[PDB]
Design a binder for this molecule. Structure first.
Ligand SMILES: [Ca+2]
Lengths: 762, 762
């Protein structure tokens, strides 16, 4: 079967006379799939004038492009919007539509938003907007239908809209949408309220009194009750889901290939709402994702990013496991950073398959130019360090792109490998919204700065990645106790509040034999912000009340001690913790404990544990201590803790996240070898695997080609590779045996290779 | 003629039995100077208990440390505080002092600040603080006196306190200092007011009627008049200046070596206040600076930083030219970043001498550890990727540190070269304070986000660096019209207000033949925020009133056209510009003009010109357009504009700011040659200079050592070097001549070298 290995070529931003050259160059890099949008405002340039054949402009020849992709043997992923984002005028929506029907434009709470803002926000469920989208889909889908793979054409998938986020306004609670149709009496907001709550529930949740749903005004400021603001958030998401459902139902009438969506809401925990909604409405949508890190500055992809990458790949693996559809990154950043240096690019691109994403599309692959009148974010240019530049040049990040494709296309044992960690991070969706907004309720003892404490450069999750602790992600609200019990250890970041349903389940998880780590407090309020203390009462742990600081100058530095740990630095307030056995103290004040209940355990830290790097390295040592205390053992040993190992059964992903030489021993599944990673990069090390007949116990290099009794290896990170096979190397090309010893059937070799590449023959 | 090339070894955080080994390793790196603090709270651990010999702890042996330094033939830079910052408890102030005289502590407008915050802020001028600082100086200066270079010891210089910034509070307008002594009736604030302003002056500037000076309460919030809040800032700066003068007067009684100070106020434009103050009080203080970029993440030093580096070096050059003191960077970042990759480190370290800073100390050179009770920002550890580690390992950033040192020591010609650019940026100190607070007055048409539009990743100043336009910085307020006229072109970033004096001098600069570039508006107010239009009226240019946006989502993207510039993207409001010759449009709307008045010209742009990278490259081309309009020619030519060239007379600093291969011709002072920069790095190319007898026309490598009839070259960015000389090469060590040709007595060689180093003999 086929690994999708793609590049984005947006035919409408590249000269038609260059399409075939650019596509042949894409094929020479090992790409088997083309991604492109079809832009509504490009193909309907005036109302009612549709051009898919280049009648009015050569780059309107969509049919011509699809014919050429077919002729050259590509699969096509087609993304017809209507919203395509794409740094493109109005994200693909016709200017003439916005100008003749400005009633469709989404409103702020003071009224009309400025008209000169990018991707003019539109009320998705305005019937005038949906009428125009239906006319677009009725014009473009007949073409897509003819070019489906099922009809002997290249199109293997259709994507819905583009990371639909209410036009990148969902990030602000009160920017949108106050259009008359959503807020008028008995409007969309009042109808949603009726569908989801009793009028008595809303009187309770808002602490007000209501005569009908029609007198509940949408919230307008952070001075309103948090549950009301979370309802407005989940309401805007439900309008996005209803829009997606309208598009899906229309697309289904035309196509029989799989239907996909990219990053709903441009959020992650909120995919809980996506999961529940497509389950309820029985929509067979493939969730796809994307990886962007640097905009309009140099690419910056170093160890700082690993918390975010492990969290996002974890949320994605959690959801496609439940939805049971194949993983795909439809946009893997290859543009819009000033330079993309190939070793930083490698650390991102090579970790996608390591973290479960073996179908990959690179965006933007082919640099181009924006036709006059369609500029938005870049003016005329559409070539910001694309792998293939406007003049046909090949830029440096083509190199990792080629090698990863050669590996994935030749190694079906890898795609069948699975990341199966003993450790999960327990995400709580309501926290996402508070963190996004930057909204800390006056009464909260904890900071909503999760970017700093949980996700970023010094985040806990970056700490776990750099501490050699790969982790899955589980939704606390969706997950059952049986699902939580698949994990030996679950880490949870707590703010003031946490639902009764979640705390009851967490309690049963530890009773049943689960191990919890909770920081930097325990919850004191339920989902309705009412006093509630289930975890406190169950664990028999009191946690001091103390107000986290927001003023950067007023955030303290505090030194924490533990067994064999002298003065580990932490930021912001540290809470006394009472109950169970002390495991961390600031002098005499106990600030972390461990408790046992039924078969399980909980560690509670009254501080925010973060990723700091130092000689002393206490942060990573403190992670080892929490694993040791709860009996959590890694499936691997490293003599150098700077070697990152992600186990995938018959492969080990070996990572040096720094441009700094790293050396040491790896032990895994009965075998031990030396690795030498002289710079930043990633290896895919086979373990106890048959490759083209040859039985490899281990190889300290990525197997990158197949032959009759031959293996081609790549080790760009050293000039020395160890291979162990049960069998004999009868010839080495591109290198020579420096060293070998037989042990019955086993032959353990050290090969010295002048370049990155060598072949053996058995 | 000795160049200071220094490392920081803080004896008090390194084991005493390690001092000699660490200093010998520093000697082996070519360092000739040692920097260290003397921490008051370390040597007076209780009130009256002084220990400089290690009676109570071996790391309190300051005396032994200076003996060892002297014995190993180092100079010493000594920094006895009393505030040393240093990520050290209270920044060096004793806990016993603060606990027994809490009245010295700085107050907020709401009263005392929390006691757990780092570097607890102190009223500098409180007599009880001063009495105890003087006792510290009375004990520590008799030792410093003994060890001065004038009395046969190693101490060359004494530094006052540490980048004194009111304890890192100056950055918040109303966090500090409301202590009784500064704010009581006829206290320090009322005294300052009287001394600086006639009372009626204060009433005109604030727009309130006052009876007496003691009615004027210090400002408390951003609702009060901007000119009063700027008075509060400059008053906080004056209290720091008084504190520096008291320290200096006391230091002068013991020492006859230069006295120095690091980054007053942790600001740059505010150095105007420091210059006026030491000129006024006739203090002979050496202004020293520092370069810090990345904290508690990986080191990030790529092209993005060059706006800031050029701006900060330029502010520094502007002021040491005026104070007539030698340049020095007393802290050049070598620590506190997770990894410092040697190419990114080199781009910073190699640009300091390029930009006029040829005396350099690296901080922190030797990793250590914090004794118990003296921890603050890092807990126990004081080894965060230092060049020399706690275990004596040498980390990768030692490599550029070694070669730069060898170059400075062996090329006296280089220090006597000058950077003398045709171009200057005009800084304006009132804009620094507004940008620092993030305070935009309600009435202001312009944004105060200078970090975005001016300084950072996409700053104007970054676009100038990357467009091959080196620039000086001049202060608009201190500079004469005669001094402005030393520049063929001045670039000015304008907000709503500009002083009537500066607007006068700018008009005279253009009348007398200067070339101004002003964006993104012309000023409309004077220093008192009163309507005033001298610049607009003089140029005969009207600029549209339009309100710049702050909400990220509401900030538009706009394409600008000019001749041979198709849709150059800009951000935020673009203003119509009336009067003068149109040179930039948005559609039909003129948004940029050139006028001529008297002998000179002004270009006025109604938009924020920023640094964006693309194939079409319009932002750099738009810089070339401006230089062409106003007759500004570079001193050099490059066939490939990605070769950054900083001319220094006899030397050409050649720069590749990316890890991307760069190839091209350079033409300078009538010679032409090819360079090959295969990764990120810097070469110091000699041009028509005599290097130990050898007449070098050019060499495409850094001359890193001389002998009799020999030059050792370093070229780590290629394996070929071009050398043109008046004589003949009789011997090549570490390479061979690939190609040669004569022209009269001149011989031109291509040398192939297998490593970065080779030697020629003539
Ligand atoms: Ca790099």
């Amino acid at each position: 079967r086929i690994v999708v290995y793609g590049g984005t070529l947006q035919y409408f931003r590249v000269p038609r006379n260059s399409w075939e050259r650019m596509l042949k160059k894409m094929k020479s890099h090992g790409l088997n799939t083309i991604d492109t949008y079809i832009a509504w405002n490009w193909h309907e340039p005036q109302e009612g004038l549709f051009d898919f054949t280049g009648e009015t402009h050569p780059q309107r020849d969509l049919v011509g492009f699809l014919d050429l992709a077919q002729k050259l043997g590509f699969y096509v992923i087609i993304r017809p919007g209507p919203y395509i984002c794409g740094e493109w005028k109005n994200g693909g929506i016709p200017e003439w539509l916005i100008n003749s029907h400005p009633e469709i434009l989404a409103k702020g709470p003071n009224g009309t938003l400025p008209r000169d803002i990018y991707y003019p926000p539109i009320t998705y469920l305005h019937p005038t907007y949906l009428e125009y989208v239906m006319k677009w889909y009725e014009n473009v889908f007949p073409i897509i239908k003819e070019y489906l793979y099922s009809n002997g054409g290249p199109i293997i998938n259709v994507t819905i809209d583009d990371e639909p986020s209410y036009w990148e306004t969902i990030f602000q609670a009160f920017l949108t949408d106050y259009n008359e149709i959503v807020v008028k009496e008995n409007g969309i907001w009042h109808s949603w309220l009726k569908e989801n709550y009793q009028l008595d529930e809303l009187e309770e949740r808002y602490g007000q009194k209501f005569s009908d749903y029609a007198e509940i005004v949408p919230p307008t400021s952070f001075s309103e009750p948090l549950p009301k603001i979370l309802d407005w958030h989940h309401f805007k998401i439900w309008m996005i889901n209803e829009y997606v459902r309208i598009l899906y139902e229309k697309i289904k009438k035309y196509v029989d290939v799989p239907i996909s969506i990219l990053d709903p809401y441009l959020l992650l925990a909120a995919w809980k709402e996506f999961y529940l909604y497509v389950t309820k409405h029985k929509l067979d949508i493939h969730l796809w994702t994307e990886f962007w890190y640097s905009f309009y500055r140099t690419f910056d992809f170093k160890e700082d990013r690993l918390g975010h990458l492990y969290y996002k790949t974890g949320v994605y693996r959690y959801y496609i496991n439940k939805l049971k559809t194949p993983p795909l990154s439809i946009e893997t950043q290859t543009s819009l950073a000033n330079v993309i240096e190939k070793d930083e690019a490698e650390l991102l691109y090579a970790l996608l398959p390591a973290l479960g994403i073996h179908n990959i599309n690179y965006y933007l692959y082919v640099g181009g130019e924006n036709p006059k009148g369609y500029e938005s974010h870049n003016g005329a240019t559409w070539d910001v360090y694309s792998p293939i530049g406007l003049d046909g040049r090949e830029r440096q990040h083509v190199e990792p792109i080629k090698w990863i494709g050669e590996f994935l296309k030749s190694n079906m044992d890898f795609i069948e490998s699975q990341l199966k960690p003993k450790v999960a991070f327990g995400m709580y969706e309501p926290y996402e919204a508070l963190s996004m907004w930057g909204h800390r309720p006056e009464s909260f003892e904890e900071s909503v700065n999760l970017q700093e404490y949980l996700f970023g450069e010094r985040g806990l999750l970056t700490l776990l990645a750099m501490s050699n602790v790969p982790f899955d992600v589980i939704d606390l609200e969706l997950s059952t106790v049986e699902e939580m019990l698949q994990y030996e250890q679950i880490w949870i970041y707590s703010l003031d509040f946490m639902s009764r349903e979640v705390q009851e389940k967490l309690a049963r998880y530890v009773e049943e034999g689960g191990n919890l780590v909770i920081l930097p407090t325990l919850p004191s309020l339920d989902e309705n912000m009412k006093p509630y203390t289930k975890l406190r009462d169950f664990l028999g742990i009191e946690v001091e009340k103390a107000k986290a600081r927001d003023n950067m100058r007023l955030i303290p530095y505090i030194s924490v001690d533990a067994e064999e740990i002298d003065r580990m630095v932490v930021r912001n307030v540290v809470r006394e913790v009472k109950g169970g056995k002390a495991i961390a103290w600031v002098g005499d004040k106990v600030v972390g404990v461990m408790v046992r209940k039924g078969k399980g355990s909980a560690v509670v830290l009254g501080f925010r544990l973060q990723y700091y790097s130092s000689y002393h390295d206490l942060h990573r040592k403190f992670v080892d201590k929490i694993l040791q205390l709860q009996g959590i053992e890694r499936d691997f040993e490293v003599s150098n803790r700077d070697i990152i190992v992600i186990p995938r059964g018959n492969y080990l992903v070996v990572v040096n996240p720094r441009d700094d030489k790293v050396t040491g021993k790896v032990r895994y599944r009965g075998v031990e070898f030396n690795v030498e990673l002289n710079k930043r990069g990633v290896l895919y090390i086979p373990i106890n695997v048959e490759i083209n007949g040859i039985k490899v116990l281990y190889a300290t290099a990525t197997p990158v080609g197949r032959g009759e009794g031959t293996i081609r290896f790549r080790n760009h990170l050293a000039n020395v590779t160890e291979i162990a096979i049960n069998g004999k190397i009868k010839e080495v090309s591109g290198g020579y045996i420096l060293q070998e010893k037989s042990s019955g059937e086993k032959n353990i070799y050290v090969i010295k290779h002048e370049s990155e590449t060598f072949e053996i023959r058995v």
